[PDB]
């Protein structure tokens, strides 16, 4: 539901409007305080004209309009009003709901600011690992499967629009020893490790392999595979390259910083 | 002094000044009492609005809202109206400002809305006093209840032309030798000055030119010393 950021652009714009009204009023409450060569702060009133011309930027919202036409009668809230008027202590939900946002957002502020960690160093479950890569599953065309055919460690691959399947060996986490093969895959009866590729499929391996060594936590292991699996889907386009052209070597695939770019270019 | 009249059996000054013993109110009926023909002076009446109308307005304005402010920090609170003779002198200017409209429409308006003109029940209440306050006589209630409401017609921030004080007996004097730290009558008293704005004595800061037309009386008549106004100083024009 977004449309909330857009009525309360349009109520900031409304605002603003009602402000700029008050300032060009206020302005023209004023005359020239120190000029002594040429009037000019009269062009100012013509630029106050412009915060006037905002006043059309209210009306972009005529874009932003027709966001909520329904029936759905406030969605489930009314318990005491419309209902047991000796209910009277129903707000107490609102308040809930307020109190559980700001802390949610409070929390994520922390945690994301919270990076520069201050540990030194710490000094003075085969049925979990299938559970987590069903639960990563649930992303659409990202199908995964595994069947572990040698060995208790896992044996996951990926395929997600092409025929670029990766398979990633894992230990229950921290998923190292990535292969990926375009085209082919299980040769055999099994998994292979033919690692065959077009010089840039390979390069593809490497870069895995590298954001494995790289975006390796000391512990919580669900965030890890979380971002592996956001940096493998990352790749669903392979088809811009920004800093150059769109042909700067054999393939410009690299994006391990939340972005595509033109290869070799570290 | 302005009555270039016809001449006629006696003089504009005293036959205003017997103007005082008048009827009660409604000065519509005065005017008519005393005379309404040999008033008009110049087509180019547009003078007193834009300087002096206002100005008497809002003094007059002001003394109608003093009224309620009885019990003001003050044991005269801001002003007194116990003389009435200047308050003659304020209704001999209203009946006369209400001929000039009648001929010039440049008359004074309300200044704030709704003139439904609107000087009508001002004058019948300052007349209302006046009975109390012609001579030997005290102040009066039913007045109190008929200033004490505020019709959409009363404005506020007057001038009060004053001088700043100087208490420095042995007591204190925040001053230099220089940089003096910063902390007006026919109006042209604006945000910060944009014109020659000639220091005076104790408010008029008024400026040299005037862009006058002929309205030459008043610049002539203060070139002099003012009252309170001997203190001509030449300010400069540090607009903030």
Redesign the interface.
């Given at each position: 539901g977004v449309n909330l950021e857009a009525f309360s652009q349009a109520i900031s714009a409304i605002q603003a409007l009602r402000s700029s009204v008050s300032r060009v009023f206020d302005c023209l409450?004023?005359?020239?305080?120190?000029?002594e060569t040429l009037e000019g702060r009269e062009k100012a009133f013509i630029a106050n004209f412009q915060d006037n011309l905002h006043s059309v930027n209210r009306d972009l919202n005529e874009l932003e309009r027709l966001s909520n036409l329904v029936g759905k009668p406030s969605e489930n809230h009314p318990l005491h009003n419309s209902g047991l008027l000796s209910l009277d202590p129903y707000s107490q939900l609102l308040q809930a709901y307020k109190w559980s946002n700001k802390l949610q957002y409070h929390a994520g502020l922390a945690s994301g600011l919270l990076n520069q960690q201050s540990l030194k160093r710490s000094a003075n479950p085969q049925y979990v690992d299938d559970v987590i890569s069903r639960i990563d599953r649930m992303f659409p065309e990202m199908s995964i499967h595994l069947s572990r055919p040698n060995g208790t460690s896992a044996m996951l691959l990926v395929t997600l629009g092409k025929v670029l399947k990766v398979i990633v060996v894992m230990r229950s986490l921290f998923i190292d020893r990535t292969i990926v093969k375009g085209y082919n895959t299980e040769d055999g009866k099994l998994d292979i490790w033919s690692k065959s590729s077009y010089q840039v499929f390979q390069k593809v391996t490497d870069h895995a392999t590298t954001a494995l060594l790289h975006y390796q936590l000391p512990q919580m292991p669900d965030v890890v595979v979380r971002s592996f699996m956001t940096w493998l889907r990352s790749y669903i386009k392979l088809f811009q390259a920004p800093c150059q052209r769109c042909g700067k070597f054999l393939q410009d695939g690299l994006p391990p910083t939340w972005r595509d770019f033109r290869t070799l270019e570290a | 002094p302005h009555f270039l009249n016809t001449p006629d059996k006696s003089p504009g000054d005293r036959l205003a000044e017997i103007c005082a013993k008048i009827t009660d109110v409604d000065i519509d009926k005065v005017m008519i009492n005393l005379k309404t023909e040999e008033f008009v002076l110049d087509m180019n009446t547009l003078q007193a609005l834009q300087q002096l109308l206002q100005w008497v307005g809002d003094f007059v304005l002001y003394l109608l809202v003093s009224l309620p402010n009885q019990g003001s920090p003050l044991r005269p609170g801001h002003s007194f109206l116990r003389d009435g003779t200047s308050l003659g002198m304020l209704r001999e200017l209203m009946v006369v400002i209400r001929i000039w409209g009648l001929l010039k429409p440049s008359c004074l308006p309300v200044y704030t809305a709704t003139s439904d003109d609107s000087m009508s029940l001002l004058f019948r209440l300052l007349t209302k006093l006046w009975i109390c306050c012609r001579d030997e006589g005290a102040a009066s209630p039913a007045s109190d209840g008929l200033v004490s409401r505020l019709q959409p017609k009363q404005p506020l921030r007057l001038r009060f032309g004053r001088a700043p004080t100087l208490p420095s007996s042995t007591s204190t004097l925040q001053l230099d030798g220089l940089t003096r730290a910063p902390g007006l009558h026919l109006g042209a008293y604006p945000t910060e000055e944009c014109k020659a704005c000639t220091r005076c004595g104790c408010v008029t800061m008024l400026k040299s030119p005037n862009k006058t037309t002929a309205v030459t009386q008043w610049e002539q008549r203060w070139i002099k010393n003012c009252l309170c106004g001997g203190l001509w100083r030449r300010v400069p024009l540090s607009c903030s």
């Open positions: 409450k004023d005359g020239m305080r120190n000029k | -």
